[PDB]
Design a protein around this ligand. Sequence first.
Ligand SMILES: COc1ccc(NC(=O)[C@H](C)Nc2nc3c(cnn3-c3ccccc3C)c(=O)[nH]2)cc1
Ligand SMILES: COc1ccc(NC(=O)[C@H](C)Nc2nc3c(cnn3-c3ccccc3C)c(=O)[nH]2)cc1
Ligand SMILES: COc1ccc(NC(=O)[C@H](C)Nc2nc3c(cnn3-c3ccccc3C)c(=O)[nH]2)cc1
Ligand SMILES: [Mg+2]
Ligand SMILES: [Mg+2]
Ligand SMILES: [Zn+2]
Ligand SMILES: [Zn+2]
Lengths: 326, 326
Amino acid sequence: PTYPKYLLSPETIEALRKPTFDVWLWEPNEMLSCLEHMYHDLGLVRDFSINPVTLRRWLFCVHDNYRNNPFHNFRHCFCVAQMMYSMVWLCSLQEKFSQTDILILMTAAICHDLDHPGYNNTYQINARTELAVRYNDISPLENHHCAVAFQILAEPECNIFSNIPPDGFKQIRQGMITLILATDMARHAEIMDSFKEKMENFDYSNEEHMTLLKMILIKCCDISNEVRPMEVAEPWVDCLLEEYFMQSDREKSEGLPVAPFMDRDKVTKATAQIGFIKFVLIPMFETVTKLFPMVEEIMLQPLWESRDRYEELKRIDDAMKELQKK
Amino acid sequence: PTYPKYLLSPETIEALRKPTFDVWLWEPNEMLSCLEHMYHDLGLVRDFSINPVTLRRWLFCVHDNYRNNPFHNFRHCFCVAQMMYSMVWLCSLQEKFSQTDILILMTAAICHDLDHPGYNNTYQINARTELAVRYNDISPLENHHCAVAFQILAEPECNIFSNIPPDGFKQIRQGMITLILATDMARHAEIMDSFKEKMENFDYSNEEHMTLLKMILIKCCDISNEVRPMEVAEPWVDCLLEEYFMQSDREKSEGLPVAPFMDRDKVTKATAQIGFIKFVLIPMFETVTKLFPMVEEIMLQPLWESRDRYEELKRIDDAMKELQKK
Ligand SMILES: COc1ccc(NC(=O)[C@H](C)Nc2nc3c(cnn3-c3ccccc3C)c(=O)[nH]2)cc1
Ligand SMILES: COc1ccc(NC(=O)[C@H](C)Nc2nc3c(cnn3-c3ccccc3C)c(=O)[nH]2)cc1
Ligand SMILES: COc1ccc(NC(=O)[C@H](C)Nc2nc3c(cnn3-c3ccccc3C)c(=O)[nH]2)cc1
Ligand SMILES: [Mg+2]
Ligand SMILES: [Mg+2]
Ligand SMILES: [Zn+2]
Ligand SMILES: [Zn+2]
């Protein structure tokens, strides 16, 4: 017949394995279904005896704890989780990783931005917010995301880990905290340097080596929008700027310092992305290719195309702003 | 928070394992949810690699193929399956049957009345209907139910058996055909004897003994309404008689012979159940108790009560009639 949206079509489930997945077509429930599918399709529900109904109540509770920010919302959480899923296949991670590592990667991806307020760490700190005070100015948001993540898992009806031995729970919790805190871009340069150092002789058996690979992987998925088709990727830039402007506006109406790349008067869609793709996204993915070559053709390619389009879009912006000058 | 209806609550997941579960409390979505749970709970999803999304579409296609009959509708098949599920627990059937036989048992129960027209075989045959002509008067309805069942499983996106090797599929299909065809009451006495015969020295090793046991199991669940609590059971009697009268009226209208037990001028809710419980239901469960003693308390007990209740209800009924000519 013609089943309800909650049910994915076999086509959708096939496309769910690729980074070309159009994340914009779905309602929260269809997304919840794709997330649910990923846990089954990866052996996680199986290998960790996750109660199938609990998996769903957990996903609803998670979704319920994301806010309606223009960027940091549940759909962002979904893109990140969905991209991570694509990489588990693209790079055949289940070969290099244990199921516990996969559990940690996916679960951290889904919870990495829980309860985000829409104003980054810098605002929190400069505004001396309740979060900044609670976390002594140390990765306040990310710390907060973890806390909320484990508060949700503390509710028995949502505890997708209730059938995991405490020894393994401790390992999963430690892994998730490390990954969620690694998403703080303040630590980008440091983490990248650490990874590249280990890269001088990677070892899939070295535990510190694998922890950095996972940190790099979740970081990759978190900021991978431009890896997607321009039609799917662009609307995200607008949401990010919408959130950025909202913060800077507030920072101005409070005399608090403002960042150039978040300032209405100094940034454009293209200037936001050119620097980012060239000095952040590409280098990070570039070093990952050395570990997984297929990454180049599937993710480094669209990034070059992306970087090129904005570099052109920038010339037109300038040309139009020169006819607005006096 | 408050999760949608298709997410079963713990209290429901536990009541679902008993013949005492109240089937009239749910809507198709909730019932579709309970069925899905059953497959997960019995580990059928596990041991057969049933893609969980595929299972959802399938149950949905099955629900679409049931008709708005007063008795033979989706809710009826839900009862049959739920009762089957109950017995797997009560009787610890997984201790006697393989996961293949439990799959056959459960799947057959859900499909046993697919696309039922609302008029029994006697009607199909006397009216020389298309089904009667298609099946040469041999169990036209049961053969049809089975055929729709496999027409549904033939749709790639509904084939919950997609990951079973063809060797296994064959075995599942033969079992299902056997079980669904065994539900034709015209075959009752015949099947009861084969079973009673082999019961003299039942042997779970013997494949023929197991086939008869499974045939008895699906037959028990298919007509088990009276095993359920008087409140849950009674409404079904009305649904059945409604369906029966619909047929008898049409038969009288088209000059076709009418069955006494479907005659509006002879049948009464009471007389219908006394004969049925005493001569069909109780005798069948009595023989099953010899293999599963726990059945006597959980199923025979409520049947004795129901029998006495309708028998008293018959005295009242007579008393009331004679009070109308004295
Ligand atoms: C101090 O650490 C940082 C912070 C920001 C940036 N780059 C940006 O924020 C640029 C200007 N905008 C940008 N930021 C992006 C994108 C994707 N995620 N993402 C993002 C979102 C929240 C926090 C940080 C970043 C990078 C993106 O496509 N563009 C680079 C490094
Ligand atoms: C020839 O096979 C039959 C057919 C009917 C009966 N007796 C009945 O149908 C009695 C009068 N009504 C009855 N019939 C019932 C019940 C449950 N299923 N069920 C039923 C439904 C469809 C076809 C046959 C039966 C027995 C029930 O609780 N009562 C007994 C034997
Ligand atoms: C399978 O169809 C049957 C046949 C018999 C019964 N049980 C009875 O015969 C009931 C308990 N006693 C009874 N039943 C009667 C009478 C007349 N018709 N009738 C009856 C009741 C239900 C169904 C068919 C008939 C003929 C009657 O005088 N007494 C119940 C269902
Ligand atoms: Mg974040
Ligand atoms: Mg039937
Ligand atoms: Zn994020
Ligand atoms: Zn039936």
